[PDB]
Design a binder for this molecule. Structure first.
Ligand SMILES: Nc1ncnc2c1ncn2[C@@H]1O[C@H](COP(=O)(O)OP(=O)(O)O)[C@@H](O)[C@H]1O
Ligand SMILES: [Mn+2]
Ligand SMILES: [Mn+2]
Ligand SMILES: [Tl+]
Lengths: 234, 234
């Protein structure tokens, strides 16, 4: 929270603070503020924007909204070159400071509140198992004369015939066969574990990691469940 | 047939193409077959028209019986290549079942449903163009004659539906050779019907079996591309 956050700023000699939130489609957004702009004020009433610039939130007249830092979400970015602290925010309507109808995070919080209000239970537990793909090259496009998409990865079964400049090493997962062969067939052990270490450094708890069924790099990192809204943050 | 192949090969050449009579050049698409329509005659009368099944004479049925009895041996001549067996593969249209029918296509012997008794005959569908027309045709005949000389009843017609109508009694219907090695074997053992009338001699048969046996060796001994797809990462 506020009190704790001011600590992390000095403990890590933080130079910037990255304000993050999620749009209607579900894509994380951000804006960066120098560490020196963080103060008492900031936590109680946030900082606002020229928002009319986002999608599904665009009202021609009433374009201004408030970014409300949630001090509990503070975490250091492990990629940025300059020490920067990430702080997830809620989008609140100005003055009222109630919580934008179209803010996905506010909506999830309202649903958690409503669970308690009906007395049916006090907490909702969520454990998503999101899967993904790791490729080497992805190309696509669409114009009046045509369209196309070309996927490529070192694991793609279609590359069994490809000439590589240091020679084709040939150990790759066939179609629907990338399940659990040990390396070198599975080329992502080091990659997955790095993802796990970092996820944990960012507050997540990892339960397992493994290659998935598809060829061309399907992978998965299983993380531990958590309360609904916190899990969506995760 | 020899003149036919000559014209095809040379007209193709003369047009900047290249023709092949190989039974199965591509996996995943149709192979090339050489169905053989046949009938016997005496003093201008078709000995195959009668009162029996689909207009057939009983003489025609014994002919069929003979072909079914000696099918695997006939295969060594009508399907003389290892490639031939990549066409005669449990497909649904693939004529591999040793049975006769006017409609069923699983049946390797179709009975042309025809108007005039003058045109009644049988169509042995398993031969392919790689077959030596002389030896293949002769073998078909000699088998049919052994069916007649010995009144070999062809059993009942298979009008129902193919083995894709899987194991109903495991569907232990007689089938054609599943490989060249097997057809060659059959020809070795089941050679008597051919030696009849001193048509085929032992040396003639053994000489043939040996030529084909060395061709079979090349294919059985040489690593296949697909074996790498399947076993390189073993
Ligand atoms: N109430 C609950 N009690 C225990 N585990 C839960 C509960 N609610 C959700 N979970 C979550 O189930 C999820 C894991 O599934 P997992 O089978 O290991 O994934 P995958 O087989 O797809 O790689 C975890 O995120 C787990 O913590
Ligand atoms: Mn999974
Ligand atoms: Mn035909
Ligand atoms: Tl065909």
């Amino acid at each position: 929270s506020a009190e704790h956050v001011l600590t992390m700023l000095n403990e890590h000699e933080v130079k910037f603070v990255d304000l993050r939130f999620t749009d209607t489609k579900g894509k994380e957004q951000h804006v960066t503020i120098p560490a020196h702009q963080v103060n008492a004020e900031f936590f109680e009433e946030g900082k606002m924007f020229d928002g009319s610039s986002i999608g599904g939130w665009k009202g021609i007249n009433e374009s201004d909204m408030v970014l409300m830092p949630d001090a509990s979400t503070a975490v250091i970015d492990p990629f940025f070159a300059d020490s920067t602290l990430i702080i997830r925010c809620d989008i609140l309507e100005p003055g009222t400071l109630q919580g934008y109808d179209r803010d996905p995070r506010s909506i999830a919080k309202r649903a958690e509140d409503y669970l308690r209000a009906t007395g049916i239970a006090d907490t909702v537990l969520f454990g998503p198992e999101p899967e993904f793909f790791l490729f080497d090259d992805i190309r696509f496009g669409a114009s009046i004369s045509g369209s196309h998409v070309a996927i490529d990865d070192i694991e793609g079964a279609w590359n069994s015939s490809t000439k590589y400049e240091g020679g084709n090493k040939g150990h790759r997962p066939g179609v629907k066969g990338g399940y659990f062969p040990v390396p070198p067939v599975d080329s992502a052990q080091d990659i997955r574990s790095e993802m796990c270490l970092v996820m944990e450094q960012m507050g997540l708890v990892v339960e397992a990691h493994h290659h998935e069924v598809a060829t061309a790099g399907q992978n998965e990192v299983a993380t531990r469940f958590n309360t609904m809204t916190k899990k969506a943050d995760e | 047939i020899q003149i036919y192949k000559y014209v095809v090969h040379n007209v193709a050449h003369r047009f900047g193409k290249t023709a092949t009579f190989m039974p199965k050049p591509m996996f995943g698409d149709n192979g090339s077959g050489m169905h053989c329509h046949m009938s016997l005659a005496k003093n201008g009368t078709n000995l195959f028209s009668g009162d029996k099944y689909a207009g057939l004479s009983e003489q025609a049925l014994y002919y069929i019986g003979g072909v079914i009895k000696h099918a695997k041996a006939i295969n060594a001549l009508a399907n003389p290549t290892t490639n031939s067996y990549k066409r005669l593969v449990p497909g649904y249209e693939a004529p591999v079942m040793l049975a006769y029918s006017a409609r069923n296509r699983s049946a390797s012997i179709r009975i042309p449903v025809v108007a005039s008794p003058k045109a009644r005959r049988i169509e042995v569908r398993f031969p392919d163009p790689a077959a030596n027309p002389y030896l293949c045709f002769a073998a078909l005949l000699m088998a049919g004659l052994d069916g007649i000389k010995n009144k070999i009843h062809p059993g009942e017609p298979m009008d129902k539906n193919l083995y894709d109508l899987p194991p109903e009694e495991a569907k232990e219907i007689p089938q054609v050779a599943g490989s060249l090695e097997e057809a060659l074997n059959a020809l070795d053992l089941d050679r008597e019907f051919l030696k009849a009338g001193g048509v085929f001699t032992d040396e003639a048969i053994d000489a043939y079996i040996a030529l084909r046996r060395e061709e079979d060796d090349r294919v059985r001994m040489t690593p296949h591309p697909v074996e790498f797809e399947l076993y390189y990462s073993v």
